[PDB]
Write a protein that binds this DNA or RNA. Structure first.
Length: 182
RNA sequence: ACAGUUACCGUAGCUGUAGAUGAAUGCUAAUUAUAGAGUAUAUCUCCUAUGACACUGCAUAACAUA
């Protein structure tokens, strides 16, 4: 379970499963469910509608912390076919689709699935890419709930011998990179 | 801002004259080719057209490396 700024239990709860088969089965029936809220006076409390959906992932590796700090708009893609090169294989087939990525990276591990990274110049290009992928997913009949793509992010860290944490910084100006257009 | 209303004196009430030109009309002028601001101005009757051909995008997997 996560936590808010005031060390309060955040409503964001995360679960896991031993196997992979049951993963899909969890995010198909937990929609609009009202088990209970609180057990006081031997009776149930207020209602609450359940909503389960895959919208977040976690990764821990020794070759991911450094690469994910240089670019400002970094993408993540996975669920690819048999083992592939970057310059010779990933670039060439990219032309067919509409990725429009400045650079790319790899993700070893020795599994039967690859995951190549993407880079963008402006926030608008990144945003537009998201839509493209989403649309394509439907066409292919892959699955709504099936992880296909995501947005990479750097988790907040708190070091020592510091008067103020980075997350609690009020003078930060890391919002100008996201222009607003309407 | 000033004169007039029996050829005596207080009130009261009238004509001409100022500016603002956000209507209409009469006479006379189309006279080099550097001519302007605002609801772009109101009521009622008959008939015709609109309504599937409206802007943009194939980056809507295109024109695709000796």
């Amino acid at each position: 379970r996560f936590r808010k700024d005031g060390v309060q239990g955040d409503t964001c709860y995360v679960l896991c499963r031993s196997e992979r088969d049951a993963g899909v089965v969890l995010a198909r029936i937990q929609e609009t469910a009202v088990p209970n809220r609180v057990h006081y006076g031997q009776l149930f409390g207020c209602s609450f509608l359940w909503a389960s959906r895959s919208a977040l992932f976690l990764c821990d590796s020794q070759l991911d912390y450094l690469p994910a700090r240089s670019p400002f708009q970094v993408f993540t893609t996975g669920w690819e076919g048999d083992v592939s090169e970057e310059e010779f294989k990933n670039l060439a087939y990219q032309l067919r689709l509409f990725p429009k990525a400045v650079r790319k990276f790899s993700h070893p591990g020795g599994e039967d699935v690859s995951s190549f990274f993407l880079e963008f110049h402006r926030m608008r290009d990144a945003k537009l890419t998201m839509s493209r992928l989403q649309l394509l997913r439907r066409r292919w009949r892959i699955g709504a709930n099936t992880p296909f793509f995501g947005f990479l992010r750097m988790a907040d860290l708190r070091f020592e011998d510091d008067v103020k944490f980075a997350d609690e910084d009020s003078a930060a100006d890391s919002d100008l990179d996201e222009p607003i257009d309407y």
